[PDB]
Amino acid sequence: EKNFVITDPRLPDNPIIFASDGFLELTEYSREEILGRNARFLQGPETDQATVQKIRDAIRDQRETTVQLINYTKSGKKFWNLLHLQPVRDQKGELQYFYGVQLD
């Protein structure tokens, strides 16, 4: 019910810079293993890239979106991910972060 991450689109490859304990438990990764990496590590071969394209379009356009996609825990167990994404911009109107909430 409380699974979320913050990413930094200002750093190369838009890596995760924060994850809740819920996200860690959901995905089986530790904070050490996750931070500094783009969340795409949760994807795998059975993930539909057309569905990821919607995420891509939202990030480019810098707008919120919500999509369902196949995701893999560290061990390769699949987990339910209804992903909600939201951009955050600073006072000068420049994109600052994205936050993402994983519903399961």
Ligand X SMILES: Cc1cc2nc3c(=O)[nH]c(=O)nc-3n(C[C@H](O)[C@H](O)[C@H](O)COP(=O)(O)O)c2cc1C
Q: How far apart are the first and last CA of the chain?
A: 8
Beta-strand ranges (E) seen in the chain are 4-7, 16-19, 65-68, 71-72, 78-79, 82-89, 95-103
Q: Are 96 and 88 in contact (CB under 8 A)?
A: yes
Smaller CB distance to ligand X: residue 32 or 60?
60
Provide the residue type at 10 as one letter. Answer: R
Residue nearest to ligand X (CB): 100
Interface residues with ligand X (CB under 6 A)?
A: 5, 7, 14, 38-40, 42-43, 52, 55-56, 59, 69, 71, 81, 83, 85, 98-100, 102
Q: In the bound complex, what is the minimum distance in angstroms from residue 85's beta carbon to ligand X?
A: 5
By a kind-dependent CB cut-off of 5 to 8 A, residue 2 interacts, out of ligand X, its own copies, none, with its own copies
Work out which of 2, 10, 56, 78 binds its own copies, going by CB under 8 A. 2
Length of the chain: 104
By a kind-dependent CB cut-off of 5 to 8 A, residue 29 interacts, out of ligand X, its own copies, none, with none
